[model samples]
Target chain A: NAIAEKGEKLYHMMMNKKVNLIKDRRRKLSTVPKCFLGNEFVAWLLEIGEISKTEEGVNLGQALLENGIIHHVSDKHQFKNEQVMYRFRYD
Target chain B: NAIAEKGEKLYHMMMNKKVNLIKDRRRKLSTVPKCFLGNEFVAWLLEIGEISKTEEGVNLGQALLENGIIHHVSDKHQFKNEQVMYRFRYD
Candidate 1:
C-alpha cells in the first residue's frame, strides 16, 4: 500500500514537470540531479536490489544499466556522485 | 537546468511520503502501483534504451533484472496488462 502509492506519486511528479533532473559529469564532483526515484525510493530500491548504492551515487540497477536506459544524460556505468545525479550521463 | 531541478524536487517529494507505492499481485488484474521513476522517467529511460516496454508492463532493463533489483515485489520480468503494473512481478 505504502510502496505502491508512494511509487506512483513519485513517478507522477517526475513526469509532470514538477521538477527537473539535470545531468552533468565532467569533474570529480557531479553537478547532476540525483534520485530518479528519489533518495528514499533509491534507498528502498537499493534495499530490495532494484537500485544500487555506490560511493559516487546510486545505479539504476543492472537491468536498467545493460540496456542503456539513461545513457543519454548520464553515463550508464559510472558512479554518479552528485547530490541527486540521475541526469549526469556526461559533463 | 529544467531536467535537473525537476528531477530533484520530484525525488524529494517521493521520499518525504507525500504519497505511497503499494505492490500486489494475485489476480488477473494487478493492484500494484506503477512508475518507479515515473512514466516520464520510464519513458525517458525507454527512449534512451534504459528500460524496454513489454506487452505486459515495462522490463526494468537487463541490468536491473539480472541483478535481482526489484525482484522483491516485482518479478523483474513479465508482462503486466493492468492499468499500471510495475509491482506485478508475478500474476
Candidate 2:
C-alpha cells in the first residue's frame, strides 16, 4: 500500500516539467518513446531531497519497477543508477 | 577558449557536494573511482539552470570531454545524455 501510494505520487512528479523525457533509440530498429534515463531519474530524486543517497533512490526505483509503475526499455535488467533507458508503464 | 573556461568551471561545480559521484564497476577488472553518470551530469547542469535543454547540457559535457577535463572511463565514446560512467581527468 505504501509503495503503491509512493509510486503514484512519483509518477505524477515524473510527469512534471522537472523530469526530462526523451525519445531514445538503441541499436535496434525501433525507438523507445517518452522514456527517461535511469541516472537522471535517480539524480532528480536526490535533487528533490527525496533520498539522501543514490542507493536509496535506486531502491525506490526498484520498488517502482517491481510494482509495475516503471520498467526498463528492454525489460532485461533491474533498476540501476546507470544511463539506461526506462519508461513509465502507462506511457 | 570559451569551451575550456566553461569546462573548468563545470569541473569545479562537479566536485561540489551537489553532484553525485560514485564508484562504478563494469565487466572489466577495475573499478572506476569518483565517477559521475552522464545523465546525472546533464540533469544537474539543467537543475542548476546552467542550461535550458538537455541538448545544451550534452554539448557542455562534450566540450568537457573533448577538452580533457572529463572523460568516459573507457575513453572510447563521446559524451552523451545516458547513464555511462565518466570521470574527471585529474581524478
Candidate 3:
C-alpha cells in the first residue's frame, strides 16, 4: 500500500516535526482517495491542534506544568500530545 | 467591551499560558455581530497559530534554531507572532 505507507510516513513527519505543507501538495496527491476527503482530515488535524493551543489550552498546559502533570519546556504541547494522545499515564 | 476583555484575556492566556480551549470557543466567538465583535478576530488568531506550528513549521523552527533564528524552546511560536500569521525578523 504505497498510499498507506506514504500517508503514515507523512503523518509521522508532520507529527514529529513542523511542516509547512503547501495546499497543492495535499490537493494534488494521487494517493489520497479524493482531494475533498483527504483535505478534510488534514484540515481537521490542523483545526484540532489550533483549538488545543488557545488561551484555555495554554492555561491547561501551564496548569499541567505548574502542577507537575506535564513538564513545561520547549515543545511542551508535543510532550502533551505524546502523553494524552496515548494510553499511558499523563501524570 | 466584555468580549474584548475576555478575548484579550484569551489571547494572552493562549499566547502566554496554555489551556484546553474548547472548540466552541473559537467558532462561537468568531462570527456575526456578537455585539462585541471580537468574533472574527478570535477565529483568525487560532487559525494562523496552527499554520505556524506545522511539521514544515517545526522543521523550520529547528533549522532556525540551528541557524540561530529561534531558540528551541517550548512555546516557541507564541512569542514570534504576538498574533495570528507571520511577521518579525528571527534571531
Candidate 4:
C-alpha cells in the first residue's frame, strides 16, 4: 500500500505540474497555442504516418478531420487555382 | 512533411520497442504477470481511493467488481464466521 500510494501521489503531482507549466508557457508566448509545438511532436506524428505535412505545416486540420476529431465541408467556389480557404466550423 | 515524417517514424519505433521489452520481461518472469508491478501501481490506486486494501491484498476483486469490470454472486453459506472463500469465476 505504501508504494502504491506514493506512485499515485507522484503521478498526480507530475501531471498537475505539467499542466501548470503548459499554462504558464502559453501565457508568456502568444504564438504557441496550447497544442502547437515547434515541429517536435509534428515530426513524430508524421513518422507514424498518423499525419501528413504540407508547406504550411503538419496538416493538423487534415489529421483531425481524418480521425473524426473535426470535419470540413467546402462551400461554392471553394478554390480558384491551388488556393482554397474556408472559415472555421463548430457544431 | 520532413519533420513530421521523422516524428511519426520515431514514435512507432519507440512504441514497438516498448511493447517488445514488456513482452520479453513477462516471458522471463513467471511470477510477474503482464500487469503485476509489485505494489507500485496498486498503492497509487489505493491512495486515490480507487481501492481498499485488506489483510489479503489491494482488494482487486472488490475494485474490479465495483468498477463493473467484474461481478460476484455469492452462493449459499458464502461465509463461515468471517472466513469465506470462493472459486474463480469466468464466463
Candidate 5:
C-alpha cells in the first residue's frame, strides 16, 4: 500500500511538471510556418503521422510542413501565367 | 462551406486554457542498468530528436531498454539491492 501510494503521488508530481512543459512547447510551435522542416523524407512523415496517432506530434510535424515540400492546398504553378495585369476589360 | 465555417470557429475560439502539454523529456535514459556505467570515456547523450543516421546514432539503441532518460538518479548503493529480512524461530 505504501509503495502504491508513493508511486501515485510521484506520478501526479511528475505530471504537473510535464504538463507545463507540453503547453509551453506547443504554444512556441504555433508561431512557426510549416515550411521549415528542412527534409523531404521527414515532411512525408508529418503527413503520414496524421493518419494515425494518440497525440499530435506537432513541432516535428510543422517543421515538415513549413519546409515547402508539402502544401495545405494545391495552387497554380508559375507556368500558369494568369498575370493580374492581364485583367479582362469590363465594358 | 461547413468545413470553412467550423474551422473558422475553431481558430478563433481556441484558448490557452485547453492546450495540451504532454511530452517526454527523458534523455540517455537507463533501465539497462550498469550493463555499462559511469564515464570512463564518454557518457551517453539523449534527447527528443530523431534516431541517429547510423542504425540510430551512437545511442544505436544502446540504452534502448532504458527508454531514454537517466534513471535511478543519485544512485545510492555499491550493489543495487533490495531486501527484506527473514524471521526464523526454532523451538
Candidate 6:
C-alpha cells in the first residue's frame, strides 16, 4: 500500500496548492471543466522540488492515477509527460 | 450587474462551505468529477438559511449560472430543481 499512501499524500498536497484548473478543450473538441494539464503538473512538481526529473513526475502521476487519486480526462490514456488533461477524483 | 455581484458572493460562500462534491454518473453514462447535484445544492441553501424556499434556491442557481460561477456538467442544461449535475467554474 505504499503507492496508495504516497498517492493520498500527493493528492492532498496538489489540492492544497490550488493548481490552476482550466476547461480543457484541446483533445475531445469539447470543454472539460476543472482539468489541469499533465505538463503543467510536472512543472509544478519540479518547481516545488518534489521531483528531480520529468520522468519522476510522470511516474508520480501514474501512481496517483492507478490509485484513483487522479484520472485522465479521456479515461483512456495513462499518465503522460505531455499536454494531457487530468482531474482529481472527488468522493 | 446585481446578479453578477450576488453570484460572486455566493460562489465564495459555497466554496468556503466546502460542499460535498462527487463523481456524478447519472446522466452522461460516464463519471464526471467535482460535481454536486442541483437538488443537494438547493437543500444546502435551505439548510444554511440562505434561501427560505426551493424556488429561491433555484433562482440563485440560475443567477450563478448566468454569471459563469457554475455550469451544468454537460453544459447543455439550465439550473433546475432536480438532480442535475453542476460544477463550479474554477479559474
Considering every candidate listed, which one attains the maximal lDDT?
2
Please provide, for model 3 over A1-91, each residue's C-alpha lDDT reduced to its tens digit, 9 standing for 90 to 100: 4334533453344344243231211111112111112223234435656444346555543554465433322222223334354333353
lDDT of each: 0.41, 0.55, 0.34, 0.39, 0.32, 0.52
Error (Å) of candidate 4 at residue B45 is 1.6
Q: Give a tens-digit lDDT track for model 5, residues B2-87.
A: 33453344333332234212122221211222222222102222232333344444443344325433232232212323583322
Q: Return the candidate ranking by lDDT, descending.
A: 2, 6, 1, 4, 3, 5
User: In candidate 6 chain B, what residue range of length 10 has the lowest lDDT sum?
Assistant: B75-84
Q: Which stretches of candidate 4 lie over 4 Å from their true place?
A: A1-91, B1-38, B52-57, B62-91
Tell me the DockQ of each model, to 2 decimals.
Answer: 0.02, 0.02, 0.05, 0.02, 0.02, 0.02
Candidate 1, residues B1-91: lDDT per residue as tens digits? 4445534553454455544432222212223343333244456654555335542124433334455433333322226477864433375
* lDDT value, residue B21 of candidate 5: 24
**Is candidate 2 or 6 superior in lDDT?**
2
Give the worst 10-residue stretch by lDDT in candidate 5 chain A: A21-30
What are the candidates' interface root-mean-square deviations? 22.1, 22.2, 21.6, 24.3, 18.1, 15.7
Clashing pairs in 6: none
Q: Best-fitting candidate, measured by DockQ?
A: 3
lDDT per residue as tens, model 6, A1-91: 9899998877777666476333334332233456676677777788899899988877666555543455343322112222222333233
Q: Of the true contacts between chains A and B, what fraction does model 3 have?
A: 0.05
Q: After superposition, which runs of candidate 3 have C-alpha atoms over 4 Å from their true positions?
A: A1-91, B1-53, B74-91
Q: Quality of candidate 2's docking, in CAPRI categories?
A: incorrect
Superposed by TM-score, candidate 5 places the C-alpha of residue A69 at a distance from the truth, in angstroms, of 18
What is the TM-score, restricted to chain A, for candidate 1?
A: 0.24
Name the candidate, 2 or 3, with the larger TM-score value.
Answer: 2
